[PDB]
Amino acid sequence: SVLTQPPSASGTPGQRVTISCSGSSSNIGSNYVYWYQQLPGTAPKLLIYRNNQRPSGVPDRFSGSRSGTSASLAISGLRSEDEADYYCAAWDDGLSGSGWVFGGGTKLT
Amino acid sequence: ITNLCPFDEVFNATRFASVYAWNRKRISNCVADYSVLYNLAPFFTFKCYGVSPTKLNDLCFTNVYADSFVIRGDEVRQIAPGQTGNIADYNYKLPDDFTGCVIAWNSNKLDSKVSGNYNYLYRLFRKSNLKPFERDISTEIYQAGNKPCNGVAGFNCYFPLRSYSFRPTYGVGHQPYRVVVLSFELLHAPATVCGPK
Amino acid sequence: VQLVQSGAEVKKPGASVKVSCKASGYTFSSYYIHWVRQAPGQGPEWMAIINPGDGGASYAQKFQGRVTLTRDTSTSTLYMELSSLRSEDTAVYYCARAEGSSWLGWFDPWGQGTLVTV
């Protein structure tokens, strides 16, 4: 597939907003789901490992899970420094080609 | 009346025999619990011919055999008896009155490799078909043309064995799939292997 | 403990380009390398897999043939030569880092990136 993602997600400081990638079988159902965070004017960075506890170090406010054919990431404590974009990564195992299909693009306020 | 069968000694082995050199096994004088088979999700090929799996533990057998090999996805369909293909006519085939059944699942996380893996290979050129449940080992040079060629290969004299090229970035139907096929002789001799009663 | 890229500029259409990033730090022959290129206005894409030493690589569907990939040990460099450039392939080049002897896993730190436009 293409791992359809919401085009943007706005919010207010102190509010908890959740972003969630939408997928299908053999892409979210079978293999792991990751989450990568990119800041403007920098290089892409990883945010999570296998859909579970934090990778190495971050406030516990960042967490998420996966159900069925979709996965969700819960974000609270919105800051002006956290304004960025987030991507999903997972294996594909599709027909005629199987790589690292990423997500689309989301805007955070 | 004993402890258990070496079921995990085959399904969980690391090295698997190639197509043209499939190996048997003597599973006997043990106690078999078939419930533990239902553990891996991708049992997309567990269709069973001789007996129905649901009523699989209320009777038992005389002798069983566990073959095993690694093939590609496209030919997973042609393991059932009576099929026609380049692997069911020259490398391995089953008899018409087959009893027992087949277990297959995908394995593209262990038997595959980024560089590749030229360790599994079949036989494509052969003199003719082979009888059911038969093995061949000879690597004699195939003589396609009507000219005497010995040892030296090339045009009209080919090498019978060709190798797979497994790679992670392939698609379904080209990735390696492991296959184990059993064989049951049902109630024609003293019983040897079964589970709880 | 970090990866460093190179510099590049604009290249004419219908030509070939060279992409390379020097590596320093961890062991060179025990960690796989991922290639990803990121185009503006969308997400990034996966390119190929590398296995240092024996230079075995595997490519995806939409990028087979057009991509040449090479590695060695003494020089400790990765060669990424793209061919038949078109105006659609204006994107930044990222050489990534992997779990180690396994193509499936998380991503260790990336590079600073190299941009080429057509």
Numbering used by the authors:
A (entry chain L): 2 to 110
B (entry chain E): 332 to 528
C (entry chain H): 2 to 119
What's the paper's own text on this?
Among these variants, Omicron, with a dramatically increased infectivity and enhanced transmissibility, is rapidly replacing the Delta variant and is poised to become a predominately prevalent strain in more than 110 countries since it was first reported in South Africa at the end of 2021.2 As a newly characterized VOC, Omicron was classified as the fifth VOC by the World Health Organization (WHO), with over 50 amino acid mutations, 37 of which are located in the spike (S) protein. The top 3 most potent NAbs (XGv051, XGv264, and XGv286) against Omicron sublineages were selected for immunogenic and structural analysis, which is instructive for structure-based broad-spectrum vaccine design. To delineate the structural basis for broad neutralization mediated by these NAbs, we determined the structures of a prefusion stabilized Omicron S trimer in complex with the Fab fragments of the three NAbs by cryo-electron microscopy (cryo-EM). We obtained cryo-EM reconstructions of these complexes at 3.0–3.8 Å and performed local refinement to further improve the densities around the binding interface between RBD and antibodies, enabling reliable analysis of the mode of interaction.
Similarly, XGv289 and XGv286 shared almost same epitope residues, revealing conserved interactions at the interface for their high neutralizing potency. Epitope clustering analysis revealed that XGv264, XGv286 and other NAbs targeting the right shoulder of RBD constitute Class IV antibodies, indicating another broadly cross-reactive group, but with declined, to varying degrees, binding and neutralizing activities against Omicron due to the presence of new N440K and G446S mutations. Notably, XGv051, XGv264, and XGv286 neutralized Omicron BA.1 with strikingly low IC50 values of 0.003, 0.004 and 0.006 μg/mL, respectively, albeit with slightly reduced activities against BA.2 and BA.3, indicating that these NAbs exhibit comparable or even better neutralization potencies against the most alarming variant when compared to WT or other VOCs, respectively.
